[PDB]
Write a protein that binds this ligand. Structure first.
Ligand SMILES: OC[C@@H]1O[C@@H](OC[C@@H]2O/C(=N\O)[C@H](O)[C@H]2O)[C@H](O)[C@H]1O
Ligand SMILES: [Mn+2]
Ligand SMILES: [Mn+2]
Ligand SMILES: [Mn+2]
Ligand SMILES: [Mn+2]
Length: 359
């Protein structure tokens, strides 16, 4: 069998700094190997790194094979890792190269620097490729200028790196932006993806998936979005946009995700698409404040979102992975909650079948 529930990947030493672990991310290679990583809050020195775990049995067991380390800044690789496998070459990086992007940040949190590292041997060793984006102080407060949360995706002959940007700090508390490259070394000028006229709005945490009608779905948390629930004054509802050209989300209409029973997912979302479920496949979305998954089999029709229970617990930016050889299988991976986490975060995962979950 392929399914399992709550398999522990990593339990941190008890002396790791709160939250100890956070922000889990998985990747499936073209040979079926799985890699995984997370924010690893070790006592420094040495500078923090991103651990790389590998599974050859579809996620049932895991072993650390390497670390991605900051070789450039003497700061560490600290926040928001993202793994990606090149589906075609980009200059001297061929198809099957594994990228790890993430944010290099000094211990004192005074700067943020989105980097790209590459592995030419399926995750055993890593090399620095390029600096992408430099920002200011690594706290999510209006007026500071950090960059955060890289997400990588190919579109035709470009590689696009989507992220959150606080550097337009006189006009947007935070906005969503991207840059593109064709060689992994030179990055285009910043292009806006989503921004809101309310200064205090904080769209954040972009993820993107490709749909079978040649459209892309772009999902984010809309901080400051309308209709915050009773008692609260600011919330992070999950919104999305649809576009044929994934460099042009900025001019598209936005849509809140609300399931047919009225549930409104909020926080740190993650989207994938799988061919499972019909000609439109299934869009699957997780959010960071509840344990269910949200599905859509109508190409993002705003009235067609459903919600289903799964065994994987709620986690900040809980992530998802679809398996190429079996589109019915979905991995759900998390590394716990935002601090204070009380020493209790671990990295874990579950693999479910959508045909079983969606009954
Ligand atoms: O990854 C670690 C966390 O990141 C920092 O939050 C950054 C904000 O996260 C978002 N979603 O809630 C926004 O896009 C960013 O502004 C936080 O300090 C830390 O725990
Ligand atoms: Mn243990
Ligand atoms: Mn523990
Ligand atoms: Mn439920
Ligand atoms: Mn079964």
């Amino acid at each position: 069998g392929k399914t399992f529930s709550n398999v522990e990947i990593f339990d941190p030493p008890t002396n790791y700094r709160d939250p100890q672990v956070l922000y889990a991310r998985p990747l499936e290679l073209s040979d079926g190997t799985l890699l995984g990583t997370w924010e690893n809050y070790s006592p420094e020195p040495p500078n923090v790194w991103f651990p790389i775990v590998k599974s050859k049995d579809g996620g049932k067991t895991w072993k650390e094979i390497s670390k991605v380390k900051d070789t450039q800044n003497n700061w560490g690789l600290r926040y928001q890792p993202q793994l990606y496998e090149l589906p075609r070459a980009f200059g001297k990086y061929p198809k099957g190269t594994v990228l790890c992007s993430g944010s290099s940040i000094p211990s004192d949190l005074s700067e943020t620097l989105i980097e790209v590292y590459a592995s030419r041997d399926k995750g055993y060793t890593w090399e620095f490729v390029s600096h992408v984006a430099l920002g200011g102080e690594a706290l999510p407060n209006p007026g500071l200028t950090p960059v955060w949360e890289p997400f990588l995706m190919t579109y035709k002959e470009k590689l696009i790196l989507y992220y959150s940007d606080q550097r337009d700090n006189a006009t947007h508390s935070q906005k969503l932006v991207h840059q593109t490259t064709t060689d992994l070394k030179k990055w285009s000028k910043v292009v806006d993806d989503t921004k809101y006229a309310n200064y205090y709005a904080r769209p954040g945490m972009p993820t993107v998936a490709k749909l079978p009608n040649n459209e892309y779905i772009y999902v984010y948390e809309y901080g400051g979005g309308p209709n915050p629930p009773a008692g609260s004054d600011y919330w992070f509802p999950v919104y999305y946009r649809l576009s044929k050209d994934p460099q042009k989300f900025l001019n598209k209409a936005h849509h809140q995700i609300v399931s047919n029973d009225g549930t409104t997912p909020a926080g740190s979302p993650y989207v994938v698409w799988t061919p499972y479920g019909g000609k439109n496949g299934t869009i699957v979305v997780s959010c960071g404040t509840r344990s269910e998954i949200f599905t859509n089999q109508a190409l993002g029709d705003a009235s067609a979102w459903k919600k289903w229970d799964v065994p994987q617990p709620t986690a900040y930016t809980r992530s998802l992975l679809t398996f190429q050889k079996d589109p019915d299988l979905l991995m759900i991976m998390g590394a716990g909650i935002l601090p204070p986490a009380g020493g209790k975060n671990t990295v874990s995962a579950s693999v479910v079948r959508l045909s079983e979950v969606m009954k």
